[PDB]
């Protein structure tokens, strides 16, 4: 019915008017490309050949467009159509008369998409504003869209079969709009959290931590090769940090050339000892933490997620706030190129040697588990004797579960800490966790020491069978193993019952992901529909479509969210 | 023992039997995170291999068969009953867990181009097209014949030379996209000759015809099935996964010279990023690499039953130490470009990698001024119909946040469904307009002078007309 057509989603009101299928759009699998800049995207030749951007013939560009017309559709840098002044369209594929090929001012030649053509790149779902950014086009000889790895974080995209949509603006006006509003370098900092959206990620973060260590010393030829990939190099080789006996540069010395202009920033490394700031060696840090950049030169410190990541006060954030968006784009690209070429010399790996720990550490983990199981047994025996006293506001069952969970959690964390102590400097799990590229201390603990308690619906594994978790356990068994505690690590391998309980926990995780996607989508749509028309007028009042004053000034201070920074008042706290 | 239960009534035959068919192919399942086993169960259904030994006889749509299937070097005992050895899906591949050039970052994979040249992960894609000569129509007969442009009033300019006399292309003839696989003609009633009814190849198939069959179907009409074969050499978009839930595309392909090489001369067929392992905690992958190295040197297929208690990482490591390699499986690698030893020692070992059905050639689509729908006069939908990608409501909200009003206007009006209507000034209702006659008149007012041209999306015109049919009057007044 008419109401049926209009009412539902995919109806005329929403499925054909608010959103609709569009021309000049392309889609294919995305794959990595560290060599492309932040703004560049790699477009396949077939996608580039099908998509055409109409160019008006001017006296300036008549020769170039004439050559494109002569090439035709077959040769790649060609023109699919000619649009005359009358509006007549001459498809060049079917034979055009040599008279038709002649061009005069006012004709519109539809050239194939070429390098440097601005496009809009999208990945569904388009949760936030950074999910649609304008990319310059670079044509490369394979059939996948190729984008830089730093740009993956705004899109929330990884290269495991993901796909993205390519929309080509078809007019100079809309092309200029994209160029000056939606380009990737222009949206490095989000107004949502006044932090940079994009940060150094994956191999480049892991390798920047290793590159910026005090240990790293580079010989002359390696410095040559690293400087070759620096786009903004002045052409002057820095004086080596160690002139004699053999000239040897340092990783910080080369990274200082990457840092844009003169940027001043102080951040702390992840492994910074808390006591260091108070005690001596505060400025001469023993562990080479406390990153300090003075006059755009890395005086000291080991770079990590905190310094080069997506957080407020990061080196990239200070670069965007101080140097500008263009120099910051060059900064991102140069970090990636130089560090990735040094990683060929150094290399990264993950093996079983990382998962395995010392025999003493294994014995310590086992002893912690033994005494934890004994403590849980003691709590159970107290409960059976009714000696246990209920916690206020909780039933005896709830307080028993609380105490048992506390004991098991304390043992789990202690075993994890023992495993983390066992890790050497060379351990690669620790390299990735310390750099912040991937993983966490929890993952290391589960890999090496103890997987941990499996919880479903906020409780230990429930009694699915009559008063027992699995048929193998005895009825009314509230012990650690029965209710889900996985003593073995992933490396050691889970026992079969622990395997089933672990599967139950993982299933809860998967279900939560599936549910959250839909519910969050509905919430986001409702918020947008409620606030879509609110905008800052030229009175600088924030008004809706009805012109009702939502706010007299935007944010009550009339400032945009991206420019602001965290600061301390310093008059508030001190005593009189 | 220390008394736990003295009244056992039954015993499990083996704990590994709790797993199903797809989960049984996972080696060392107990050493992986649970969501990763769940993901591998789904990925294994999409892997490529010889699906059945009678695949030559069968004419199925979308059949992929790998050139050189190999049985796993590290296999579960329950795989024998699944017949996985008989019909394997995947190739054991020398896999290095390393960061080489940054093209293996995220989940992507650097593959050896020389190995790909030697047959590594090469497959064939068979697509079958069925057509039926239907005489059921009263005066319509869908005869099989080669259409002729002069004889047939309805025809298309695609290539018709391939078709033989019967209207069916012969086996062994290359077919590029937009070529006529089957030529069929419907005789046209002469109300007062021919509307073309040929079937055309899916774009970019680029295959060679394998088998052409002519039979009579259940209805008794002549039935023709044509199978087109396309070889599929792996590319830099194809999706490859291991048995431990690690899926990823091919970032780039380097030749044997460029790939890092051990001292023995072994270059990894596949390089995967080290960053995939820690967050996902798929230690079973690492144990499979170690066991595969031991198995390849020893000559015995490794055992990876989930719960064994006789196979430990330490025992595998000692076994590998006997065969002359580092006990943890790391190997000293040399950089292919410069020859210098990589300072970190890379973890190299054979691992069973699979090739998933998802390939870039099937997933690449570009649209530019294509056909439009009838009802909405908007671009079509789907790769088969050359459909444009949808600019959803979330996309328009992002563009509003940008402030790109004119790009939003182009994308939502000018690119999709531009249209013009004539609207009376006195009454907002649309008015009849004869452009060729140059006379524009509005019914209901008997007014001709006051008419204005309005540019609106065709979908908006359709919406207003559907409102009018419900007796609502959407009077759009320019004033």
């Amino acid at each position: 019915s008419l109401k049926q057509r209009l009412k539902g989603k995919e109806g005329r009101v929403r499925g054909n008017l608010m959103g609709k299928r569009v021309d000049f759009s392309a889609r294919t699998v995305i794959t990595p490309d560290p060599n492309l800049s932040i703004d560049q995207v790699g477009v396949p030749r077939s996608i580039a050949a099908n998509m055409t951007f109409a160019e008006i013939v001017t006296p300036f560009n008549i020769d170039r467009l004439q050559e494109l017309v002569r090439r035709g559709n077959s040769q790649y840098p060609g023109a699919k159509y000619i649009i005359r002044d009358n509006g007549d369209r001459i498809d060049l594929r079917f034979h055009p008369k040599p008279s038709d090929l002649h061009l005069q001012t006012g004709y519109k030649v539809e050239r194939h998409m070429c390098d440097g053509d601005i496009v809009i790149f999208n990945r569904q779902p388009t949760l936030h504003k950074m999910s649609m950014m304008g990319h310059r086009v670079r044509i490369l000889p394979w059939s996948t869209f190729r984008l830089n790895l730093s740009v993956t974080t705004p899109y929330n995209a990884d290269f495991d079969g993901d796909e993205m949509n390519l929309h080509l603006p078809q007019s100079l006006e809309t092309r200029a709009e994209i160029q000056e509003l939606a380009m990737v370098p222009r949206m490095i900092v989000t107004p949502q959290s006044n932090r940079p959206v994009m940060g150094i990620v994956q191999d480049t973060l892991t390798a920047v931590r290793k590159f910026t260590k005090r240990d790293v010393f580079l010989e002359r030829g390696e410095v040559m090769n690293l400087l070759m990939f620096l786009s903004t190099w002045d052409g002057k080789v820095p004086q080596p940090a160690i002139l004699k006996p053999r000239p040897l540069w340092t990783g910080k010395q080369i990274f200082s050339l990457i840092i844009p202009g003169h940027i001043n920033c102080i951040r702390t490394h992840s492994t910074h000892p808390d006591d260091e700031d108070s005690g001596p060696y505060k400025h001469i840090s023993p562990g080479d933490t406390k990153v300090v950049v003075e006059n755009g030169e890395l005086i000291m410190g080991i770079l990590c997620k905190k310094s080069l990541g997506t957080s407020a006060g990061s080196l990239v954030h200070i670069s965007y706030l101080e140097m500008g968006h263009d120099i910051t784009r060059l900064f991102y690209s140069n970090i990636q190129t130089v560090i990735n070429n040094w990683l060929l010399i150094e290399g990264h790996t993950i093996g079983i040697g990382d998962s395995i720990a010392d025999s003493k550490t294994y014995q310590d983990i086992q002893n912690t588990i033994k005494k934890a199981k004994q403590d849980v047994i003691e709590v159970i025996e107290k409960a059976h004797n009714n000696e246990l006293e209920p916690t206020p506001g909780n039933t005896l069952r709830q307080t028993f579960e609380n105490q048992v969970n506390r004991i098991l959690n304390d043992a789990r964390d202690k075993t994890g800490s023992s495993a983390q102590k066992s890790l050497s400097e060379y351990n690669n799990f620790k390299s990735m966790v310390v750099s912040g590229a991937k993983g966490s201390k929890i993952n290391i603990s589960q890999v090496i020491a103890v997987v941990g308690q499996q919880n479903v619906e906020g409780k230990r594994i429930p009694f699915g069978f009559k008063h027992r978790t699995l048929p193998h356990f005895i009825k009314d068994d509230y012990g650690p193993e029965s209710r889900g505690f996985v003593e073995n690590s992933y490396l050691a391998g889970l026992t079969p019952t622990e395997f089933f309980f672990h599967a139950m926990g993982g299933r809860e995780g998967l279900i939560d992901t599936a549910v959250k996607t839909a519910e969050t989508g509905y919430i986001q749509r409702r918020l947008i529909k409620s606030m879509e028309s609110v905008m800052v007028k030229y009175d600088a009042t924030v008004r809706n479509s009805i012109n009702q004053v939502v706010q007299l000034r935007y944010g009550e201070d009339g400032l945009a969210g991206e420019s602001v920074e965290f600061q301390n008042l310093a008059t508030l706290k001190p005593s009189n | 023992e220390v008394a736990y239960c003295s009244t056992y009534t039954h015993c499990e035959i083996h704990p590994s039997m709790i797993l199903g068919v797809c989960a049984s192919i996972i080696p060392f399942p107990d050493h992986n995170q649970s969501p990763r086993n769940t993901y591998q169960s789904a990925m294994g259904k999409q892997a490529m291999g010889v699906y059945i030994t009678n695949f030559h006889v069968r004419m199925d749509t979308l059949a992929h068969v790998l050139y050189y299937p190999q049985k796993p070097l590290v296999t579960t005992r329950s795989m024998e009953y699944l017949r996985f050895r008989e019909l394997p899906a995947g190739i054991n591949s020398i896999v290095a867990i390393a960061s080489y050039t940054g093209y293996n970052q995220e989940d992507s994979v650097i593959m050896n181009r020389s190995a790909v040249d030697r047959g590594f992960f090469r497959s064939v894609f068979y697509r079958s097209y069925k057509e039926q000569e239907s005489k059921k129509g009263f005066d319509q007969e869908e005869v099989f014949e080669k259409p002729t442009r002069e004889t047939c009033q309805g025809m298309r300019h695609a290539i018709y030379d391939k078709l033989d006399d019967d209207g069916l292309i012969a086996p062994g003839v290359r077919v590029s996209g937009d070529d006529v696989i089957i030529g069929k003609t419907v005789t046209l009633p002469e109300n007062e000759t021919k509307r073309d009814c040929s079937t055309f190849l899916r774009t970019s198939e680029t295959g060679i015809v394998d088998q052409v069959m002519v039979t009579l179907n259940q209805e008794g009409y002549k039935f023709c099935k044509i199978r087109v074969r396309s070889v599929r050499i792996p590319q830099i978009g194809d999706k490859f996964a291991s048995r431990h839930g690690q899926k990823g595309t091919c970032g780039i392909q380097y030749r044997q010279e460029d790939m890092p090489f051990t001292c023995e001369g072994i270059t990894p067929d596949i390089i995967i990023n080290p960053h995939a392992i820690p967050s996902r905690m798929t230690i079973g992958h690492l144990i499979e690499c170690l066991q595969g190295k031991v198995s390849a040197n020893k000559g015995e297929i490794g055992d990876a039953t989930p719960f064994n208690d006789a196979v430990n990482v330490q025992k595998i490591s000692n076994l590998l130490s006997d065969y002359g390699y580092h006990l943890r499986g790391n190997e000293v690698l040399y950089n292919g470009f410069t020859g210098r030893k990589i300072t970190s020692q890379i973890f190299i070992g054979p691992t069973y990698y699979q090739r998933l059905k998802h390939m870039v050639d099937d997933k690449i689509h570009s649209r530019a001024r294509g056909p439009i729908q009838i009802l909405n006069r908007q671009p079509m939908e789907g790769r088969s119909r050359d459909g444009g990608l949808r600019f959803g409501e979330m996309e328009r909200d992002c563009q509003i946040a940008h402030g790109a009003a004119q790009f939003l206007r182009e994308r939502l009006f000018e690119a999709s469904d531009p249209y013009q209507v004539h609207v009376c000034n006195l009454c907002g209702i649309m008015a009849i307009a004869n452009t060729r006659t140059h006379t524009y008149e509005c019914r209901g007012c008997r007014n001709k002078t006051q008419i204005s041209l309005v540019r609106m999306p065709y979908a908006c015109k359709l919406l207003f007309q559907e409102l009018m049919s419900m007796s609502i009057a959407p009077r759009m007044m320019s004033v």
């Binding site: 941990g452 919880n455 230990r460 809860e508 | -």
Partner: peptide, 8 residues
């Protein structure tokens, strides 16, 4: 899969 306070 860790604990009651962590993740499943």
């Amino acid at each position: 899969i860790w604990g009651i306070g962590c993740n499943p």
